[PDB]
Design a protein around this ligand. Structure first.
Ligand SMILES: [Mg+2]
Ligand SMILES: [Mg+2]
Ligand SMILES: [Mg+2]
Ligand SMILES: [Mg+2]
Ligand SMILES: [Mg+2]
Ligand SMILES: [Mg+2]
Ligand SMILES: [Mg+2]
Ligand SMILES: [Mg+2]
Lengths: 60, 203, 126, 35, 127, 278, 81
RNA sequence: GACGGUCGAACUUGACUAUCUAGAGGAAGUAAAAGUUCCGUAGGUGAACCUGCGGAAGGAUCAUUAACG
RNA sequence: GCAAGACGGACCAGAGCGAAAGCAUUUGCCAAGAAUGUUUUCAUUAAUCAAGAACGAAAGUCGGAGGUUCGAAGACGAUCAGAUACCGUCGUAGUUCCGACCAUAAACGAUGCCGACCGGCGAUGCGGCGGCGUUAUUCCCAUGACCCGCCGGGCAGCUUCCG
């Protein structure tokens, strides 16, 4: 069975290759990143949504 | 140590300048008619002093309404009409003081409570609450005076039918005259002697 | 003018269960106060656990009650689940802290060490 | 120097780590002595 | 005769409220809190702070013709403690010293029949 | 404060570290210096760090009168506050109060270090080395194993410390991965937090949370506005997430049994339909 | 609450919530003088075109006009010596 | 869109010309001031342990109390 | 003044009920039950039990419905005394209901069941019997409250001989 685990190992290595590749193109823009709310503020309740606009600063 | 917000503090003028004093009157049900004074702002325009003055509820001890009556019973009076510096009130409710209720509750006895919803002849719908306590005998050696559950239900059944009958047959004027000396509660105490002796029976 | 108010407090202390000589301080001094609370206020406790809480406050022969009794310069009456405290404002706070620690389960010996430190450190103790 | 702010939470850690990846990707005088 | 008013005393955990209204309780005459007198958070609930608040309230009613007061003592109620604190007692003492006439004393602490869970958990609070 | 008193344990920990002669050793909490003096024999330089000042003076008198005294260098203060000096290996009996922030401080330190030998509480250490499927697999494990290689070396008993604490101890070796994986770390943090609120729940039930659905719907509406995508009136955020979970085949999986590769698959499936956690 | 540059941008005038006005020298980071004439939050602070005079205003209902007396102070100390 | 005329700020490059400030030094003169024990279960990233819910004592009880001129 | 979700203080007792886990607002309905009373009936139909089956606090899992309060987790604000040691604000899952699972607790008298035998003394809850006297009274509803003696089965005590 130890031989089978070695063969199955290459499959995991191979599948990680394109899976990170496919994730790259689907990413969002930088302006879109700043607008999103973060999950770490879920415990605060509805108070995370009182902010109306926050990403108002940018440097060219 | 903290600056606080800019401004955020206004000059305050005296509000008593624009307000007027009114006299509140109790109905003819009680001996004493003048029960105090109240304050209201004048008619500025599109805001009526009479409108804000109506609907106010006053907590008056019955000792302030009768000459020699007990002081642990309170009456609720609500203003209904204004007649030129004379607030005119009507019966709105009745209640007992907190300390009187606290003192009645001992540890080695049974407490029976009942409530009804009965409409008077003149259309007033009322909710009445009654309370009673089991009484120890004069020659009793036993520590506790507990009533069995069927005895409690029989007493509660007699409470409701006495309260119901004494309200729907009379009108609001006659009911209040019964409430002042608590004749309803004393009638209930006599009727329940055959089931289990009781004391401190009150509405 | 304050005569009638002082007398009403005095009889109230006796009704609560305090000694007559003990309550007499309400007349002679002008800054004594009464505080009350329930044992269930500090911790929700039932049955035999509640009984052990009462015993921890009193101690054997009431010595635990007397230990805190003198050091805080206060009179305390334990009426079933109700605790009544007579003393000045600063001294009530010291006694209330010590009694609360006993209910929450601290051993009396640990409580004794703390109250000694608090009393000694306070330079002005009226 | 007050840079323990990144150690407060994991999201603060990843925000600092994300920017530190960016920097790696993007990336006395003789007069005083002789004269 | 004496003009009557109603005075509400709220002895909270960390503050004391002295509030005077009419007999109906709808019109506010004057309110002073313990924090308005003392410049510290230790002593907002001290009996001395309540005494100063009572004197300012008591003198104010004198110009307005109010001479007699009914008193409604109140604690926090609810799940929390049910009895008025020492600050409420000091305020009543100070009010009588000013010469204000005293009516009837009533405790108006909200007493739940049966209430929700109190904060603190199983272990307890106030250590 | 606790002092390790067993010389054999001190020797064994040093043996596990490579400790090349030219290496610079960073040491946190030398204490009396039993572990410190042996490192000075083999290491080019030892940068000790002690918060308590009186121990620093005690450390100096012990090394004084010895040839290795010149190599020792001492910093006084909190290491978490300040930048770490350049070092090759780290061997330290850490104060357990700062066990968590120090590990992430090491992972954030560039230039890279070869390895770090650290002492932790038994419960803390097992969670660090936990693999998927273990009861102790947690959010700390997946984040630490993402950026480093973590191994368990030995267990340390209570008797070895004076005074004896009531918890057990063990030794853990940490080696960072150079370079870190090329993923968006803000997106990675958001996904892991949602799944690990109840790590033994199914993913389908985890995403049915009312708090989670409200957060995901607002982020989706922001994303649609930026790209001018029209949202239908009858759109439900709950149906969209269920379709994504079915497509990835992760609806009945549990976060306790998910490794790093499964989360990457979940991240791409969610990002494909426009759901970005950030 | 307020900071103003004085003496050709070489000294600083500052007001605080306490009611004290502090004069600073930028080179040495040292408070030359502290002025106690207000008991509340000093919201307003202005200086003239010439550095002779300055104005202050606080939450207390008082407005105070200040004038630089450094030149008069140095005259009095020298005459004694 | 095109031309003239008029008043023209603001720019670009050479050449003169006024002040203010930067650090590191060198050679002097004054002065003697100053600084509780556990059970079951569910979690944890300032874990020498903590927390949520429900249990146990295998944990130190003082005082008043029928009615009532 | 209006709405929503939970909760059933004081009376509440070492009292009562249930196989155990457990069980507290009024009124109505449905089925069940202990003890007592019996000059009713059957006539041994019984005891203990591997296998097998029903139930089983709290927490927890799956699918729905809701969400006041409290609240693991998480984010913020602080972090004095000190062997003196875990706060504050917001508050995720949960805590509530309807269905399926899960089958564990210091789930204690740290103590198998059935039967027989083996000391006194009073109280207490229910049922029955007898009674000098007090106290209410019965259209319906109801025939009770206290005091004394006795008999059963319970919940608990104070004292003890032999063993
Ligand atoms: Mg009730
Ligand atoms: Mg359950
Ligand atoms: Mg549940
Ligand atoms: Mg659910
Ligand atoms: Mg149990
Ligand atoms: Mg057993
Ligand atoms: Mg019974
Ligand atoms: Mg009987």
């Amino acid at each position: 069975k130890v031989l089978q685990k070695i063969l199955e190992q290459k499959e995991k290595k191979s599948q990680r290759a394109e899976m990170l590749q496919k994730l790259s193109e689907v990413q969002a823009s930088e302006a879109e990143m700043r607008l999103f709310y973060t999950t770490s503020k879920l415990g605060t309740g509805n108070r995370m949504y009182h902010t109306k606009e926050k990403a108002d600063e940018v440097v060219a | 140590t903290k600056g606080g917000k800019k401004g955020a503090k206004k000059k305050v003028v005296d509000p008593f300048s624009k307000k007027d004093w009114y006299d509140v009157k109790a109905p003819a049900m009680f001996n004493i008619r003048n029960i105090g004074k109240t304050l209201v702002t004048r008619t500025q325009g599109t805001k009526i002093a009479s409108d804000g003055l109506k609907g106010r509820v006053f907590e008056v001890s019955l000792a302030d309404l009768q000459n020699d009556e007990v002081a642990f019973r309170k009456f609720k009076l609500i203003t209904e009409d204004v007649q030129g510096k004379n607030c005119l009130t009507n019966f709105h409710g009745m209640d007992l003081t907190r300390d009187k209720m606290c003192s009645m509750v001992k540890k080695w006895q049974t407490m029976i409570e009942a409530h009804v919803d009965v409409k008077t002849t003149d259309g007033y719908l009322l909710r009445l609450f009654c309370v009673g306590f089991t009484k120890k005998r004069n020659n009793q050696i036993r520590k506790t005076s507990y009533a069995q559950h069927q005895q409690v239900r029989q007493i509660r059944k007699k409470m409701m039918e006495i309260m119901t009958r004494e309200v729907q047959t009379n009108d609001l004027k006659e009911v209040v005259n019964k409430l002042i000396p608590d004749s309803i509660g004393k009638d209930i105490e006599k009727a329940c002697q055959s089931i289990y002796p009781l004391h401190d029976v009150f509405v | 003018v304050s005569a009638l108010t002082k007398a009403a407090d005095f009889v109230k202390a006796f009704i609560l269960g305090f000694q007559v000589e003990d309550a007499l301080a309400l007349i002679r001094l002008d800054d004594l106060f009464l505080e009350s609370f329930e044992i269930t206020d500090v911790k929700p406790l039932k049955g035999d656990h509640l009984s052990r809480a009462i015993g921890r406050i009193a101690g054997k022969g009431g010595k635990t009650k007397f230990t805190i009794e003198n050091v805080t310069r206060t009179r305390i009456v334990l009426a079933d689940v109700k605790v009544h405290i007579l003393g000045s404002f600063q001294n009530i706070k010291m006694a209330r802290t010590a009694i609360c620690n006993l209910i929450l389960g601290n051993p009396p010996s640990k409580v004794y060490g703390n109250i000694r430190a608090v009393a000694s450190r306070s330079a002005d103790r009226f | 120097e007050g840079k323990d702010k990144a150690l407060k939470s994991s999201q603060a850690f990843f925000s600092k780590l994300q920017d530190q990846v960016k920097m790696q990707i993007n990336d006395i005088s003789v007069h005083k002595l002789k004269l | 005769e004496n003009v009557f008013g109603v005075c509400h005393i709220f002895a909270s955990f960390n503050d004391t409220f002295v509030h005077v209204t009419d007999l109906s309780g709808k019109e506010t005459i004057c309110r002073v809190t313990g924090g308005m007198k003392v410049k510290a958070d230790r002593d907002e609930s001290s009996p001395y702070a309540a005494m100063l608040a009572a004197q300012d309230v008591a003198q104010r009613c004198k110009e307005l013709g109010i001479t007699a007061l009914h008193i409604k003592l109140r604690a926090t109620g609810g799940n929390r403690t049910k009895t008025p604190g020492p600050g409420a007692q000091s305020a009543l003492r100070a009010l009588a010293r000013s010469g204000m006439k005293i009516g009837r004393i009533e405790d108006v602490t909200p007493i739940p029949s049966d209430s929700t869970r109190r904060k603190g958990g199983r272990r307890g609070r106030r250590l | 404060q606790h002092i390790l008193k067993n010389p054999l344990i001190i020797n064994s920990i040093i043996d596990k570290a490579a400790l090349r002669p030219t290496d610079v050793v960073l040491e946190v909490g030398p204490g009396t210096g039993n572990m410190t003096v042996k490192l000075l024999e083999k290491a080019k330089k030892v940068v000790a760090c002690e918060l308590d000042p009186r121990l620093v003076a005690e450390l100096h008198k012990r090394v004084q009168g010895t040839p290795v005294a010149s190599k020792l260098q001492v910093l006084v203060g909190d290491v978490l506050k300040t930048d770490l000096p350049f070092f090759d290996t780290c061997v330290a009996n850490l104060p357990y109060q700062i066990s968590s922030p120090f590990v992430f401080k090491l992972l954030l330190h560039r230039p890279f270090f070869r390895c770090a030998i650290l002492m932790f509480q038994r419960e803390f250490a097992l969670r660090l080395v936990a693999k998927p499927g273990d009861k102790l697999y947690c959010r700390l494990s997946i984040n630490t194993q993402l950026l480093a290689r973590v191994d368990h070396l030995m267990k340390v008993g209570k008797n070895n410390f004076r005074p004896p604490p009531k918890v057990e101890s063990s030794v853990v070796r940490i080696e960072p991965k150079n370079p870190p994986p090329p993923i968006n770390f803000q997106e990675w943090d958001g996904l892991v937090r949602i799944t690990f609120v109840r790590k033994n729940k199914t993913l389908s039930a985890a995403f049915k949370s009312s708090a989670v659905q409200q957060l995901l719907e607002k982020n989706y509406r922001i994303h649609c506005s930026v790209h001018n995508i029209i949202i239908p009136e009858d759109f439900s955020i709950a149906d969209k997430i269920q379709q994504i979970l079915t497509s990835t085949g992760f609806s009945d999986k549990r976060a306790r049994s998910m490794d790093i590769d499964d989360f990457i698959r979940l991240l791409h499936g969610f990002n494909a339909e426009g759901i970005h956690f950030s | 609450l307020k900071v103003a540059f004085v003496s050709r941008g070489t000294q600083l005038l500052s007001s605080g919530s306490d009611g004290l006005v502090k004069l600073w020298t930028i080179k040495n980071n040292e408070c030359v003088r502290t002025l106690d004439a207000h008991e509340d939050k000093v919201w307003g602070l202005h200086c003239s075109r010439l550095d002779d005079h300055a104005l202050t205003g606080a939450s207390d209902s008082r407005v105070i006009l200040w004038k630089d007396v450094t030149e008069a102070e140095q005259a009095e100390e020298q005459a004694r010596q």
